[PDB]
Design a protein around this ligand. Structure first.
Ligand SMILES: *P(=O)(O)OCC(C)(C)[C@@H](O)C(=O)NCCC(=O)NCCC(=O)NCCc1ccc(S(*)(O)O)cc1
Ligand SMILES: Cc1ncc(COP(=O)(O)O)c(C=O)c1O
Lengths: 381, 76
């Protein structure tokens, strides 16, 4: 029966002590985290630039509601394509140097729609092994062949593309990987992908707005323009949603064959107004200041953990994991940091390579030097 | 009760035509007078008596009686 299958799966998870529950918070984005009636330093949010509480983005979120209401009233194929959606799409396309941009309600929606509408049964997906779940789940559900290559291994990718394929090949990867915060060699990947007559798709969720000139992201920083660029807005943008950057012919193809854009209700025009304001702050002098401030906090934290026996990662981004090496020691250090006012989450080998039980730390421009100093003090006792 | 006989009797029942008119080369729309709702229900009838899912891309190719027979026998 259905109930027997559900109870058996929950009992299997509860036996492995993976029955993880959600903890409600009053504030979860930015510098602070408010749980129960206690205030912590937030080191678990994706608000890499602190823009979730930016007054200009909040004002646009409010004035958009007073100008267009809340809901859009349908999908972009009917009456749900606001002039704000069009303005945001054009500003994103001009910002990242593409011809067209297509808005999506989330990064999941963007990745699922692109892979579903482009990959056929005779096609092949060459995905990085450490690709985020938003991209691997879509690639797995696709009727195309999924071929995972070693992390940032251009040689294995070349031997993967050289294999015979009855159709076209699509290489997907990330600009800034979400697990270890490391970047990908997009220049070498583009070269070997172009040599085998394939297209490149890059999900720059953790890099968009955070790195590059005007925060254009990883692809611009490495002087690479993939055929498909997916940027999400729930991290550095401090809002929500996503967008796919592509050419006019590819955009028309997706506008004709992706059921997400055809049927799913478009985002509220007020949310797009907040995205437009967030993009404006990202491209301004304040965007440069917040990116420089974040880099200074990262270098401050990496220099401070030089004494402890823990090891860092090849990450220059806001994601700064702290390798401990044991589940008990990592969970105990996480609780000790939470009792000292530093909200930190621990990741166990049930989800990452074994022996590398780490602390998922994230730094934001909303933090101050005293906050990183406090985090280092707690780590040093 | 062979595969060809089951396919032909399914088409004859779904389209309300005698077994005389269901020829192997007989088209559903051209020769048997089938609205596209009847063709989709005919594919769904081929999915019931055979208990096999027919994808929509392959069901678009099934336009004649021999096409349905070749599909049922060619796949498994
Ligand atoms: P005949 O006049 O040729 O009709 C063909 C029908 C029966 C309509 C069918 O073969 C078809 O072409 N369907 C269109 C795509 C589809 O799978 N739709 C399912 C049938 C339908 O019309 N359902 C309504 C809900 C719906 C509306 C729009 C879409 S969209 O993705 O095209 C999907 C489902
Ligand atoms: C794409 C993506 N990767 C990773 C994370 C969080 O990091 P992780 O769950 O791997 O610790 C998020 C948000 O939960 C995310 O959106």
């Amino acid at each position: 029966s259905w109930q027997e299958k559900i109870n058996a799966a929950l009992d299997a998870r509860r036996a492995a002590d993976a029955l993880r529950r959600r903890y409600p918070v009053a504030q979860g984005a930015g510098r602070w985290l408010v749980a129960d009636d206690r205030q912590y330093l937030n080191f678990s949010s994706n608000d890499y630039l602190g823009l979730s509480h930016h007054p200009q983005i909040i004002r646009a979120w409010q004035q958009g509601a007073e100008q267009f209401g809340i809901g859009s009233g349908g999908s972009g194929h009917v009456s749900g394509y606001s002039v704000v959606h069009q303005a945001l799409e054009e500003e994103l396309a001009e910002w990242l140097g593409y011809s067209r941009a297509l808005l999506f309600i989330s990064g999941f929606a963007a990745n699922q729609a692109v892979i579903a509408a482009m990959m056929a049964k005779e096609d092949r997906i060459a995905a990085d092994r450490l690709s985020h779940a938003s991209l691997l789940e879509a690639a797995s559900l696709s009727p195309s062949q999924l071929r995972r290559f070693a992390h940032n291994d251009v040689t294995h990718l070349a031997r993967l593309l050289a294999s015979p394929c009855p159709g076209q090949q699509m290489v997907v990867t990330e600009g800034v990987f979400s697990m270890d915060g490391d970047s990908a060699p997009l220049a070498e990947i583009q070269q070997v992908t172009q040599q085998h007559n394939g297209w490149l798709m890059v999900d720059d969720a953790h890099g968009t707005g955070v790195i590059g000139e005007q925060g254009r992201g990883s692809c611009w920083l490495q002087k690479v323009k993939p055929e498909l660029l997916v940027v999400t807005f729930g991290k550095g943008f401090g809002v929500s949603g996503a967008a796919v950057l592509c050419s006019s012919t590819v955009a028309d193809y997706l506008l004709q064959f992706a059921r997400h854009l055809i049927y799913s209700t478009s985002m509220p025009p007020a949310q797009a107004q907040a995205l437009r304001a967030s993009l404006a702050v990202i491209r301004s002098d304040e965007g440069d200041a917040r990116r420089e401030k974040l880099a200074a906090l990262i270098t401050r934290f990496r220099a401070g953990v030089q004494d402890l026996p823990f090891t860092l990662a090849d990450s220059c981004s806001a994601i700064q994991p702290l390798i401990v090496g044991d589940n008990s020691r990592a969970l105990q250090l996480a609780e000790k940091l939470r009792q000292q006012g530093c909200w930190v989450t621990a990741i166990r080998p049930p989800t990452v390579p074994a022996g590398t039980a780490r602390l998922r730390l994230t730094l934001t421009a909303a933090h101050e030097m005293q906050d990183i100093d406090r985090l280092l003090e707690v780590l040093h006792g | 009760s062979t595969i060809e006989e089951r396919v032909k009797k399914i088409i004859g029942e779904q389209l309300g035509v005698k077994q005389e008119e269901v020829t192997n080369n007989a088209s559903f729309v051209e020769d048997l007078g089938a609205d596209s709702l009847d063709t989709v229900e005919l594919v769904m009838a081929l999915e019931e008596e055979f208990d096999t899912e027919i994808p929509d891309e392959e069901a678009e190719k099934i336009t004649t009686v021999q096409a349905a027979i070749d599909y049922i026998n060619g796949h498994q």
